[PDB]
Ligand binder design. Structure first.
Ligand SMILES: [Zn+2]
Ligand SMILES: [Zn+2]
Ligand SMILES: [Zn+2]
Length: 89
DNA sequence: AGCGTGGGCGT
DNA sequence: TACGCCCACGC
């Protein structure tokens, strides 16, 4: 296929074009969590999710609302997406 | 609301 | 292989 990296775990049929994508996926089956927060010691399956988790400790909110007169800002881009959607609907 | 944790995707 | 990015769903 164009998706040679197939998951063979029991009752899973997912396949991927990339072996690293498959490796990340399989952590949902094994429970493996390689990335640990240095502040609170919680462990995470993914590096990017550790990174956004750490902002919960610092209050860093790099994503600011663009709506005039709005002061809201957010830790993650998707929070801001939801928020912008809210303003116009 | 805030944030866990998958996906496709880029580099 | 490393690390994320945005998108999205689900509490
Ligand atoms: Zn699988
Ligand atoms: Zn933490
Ligand atoms: Zn706003």
């Amino acid at each position: 296929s164009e998706k040679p990296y197939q998951c063979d775990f029991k009752d899973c049929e997912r396949r991927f074009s990339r072996s690293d994508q498959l490796k990340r996926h399989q952590r949902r089956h094994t429970g493996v969590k390689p990335f640990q927060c240095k502040t609170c010691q919680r462990k995470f399956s993914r590096s990017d999710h550790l990174k956004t988790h750490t902002r919960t400790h610092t209050g860093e909110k790099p994503f600011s609302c663009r709506w005039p007169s709005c002061q809201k800002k957010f830790a993650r881009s998707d929070e801001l997406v939801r928020h912008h959607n809210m303003h116009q609907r």
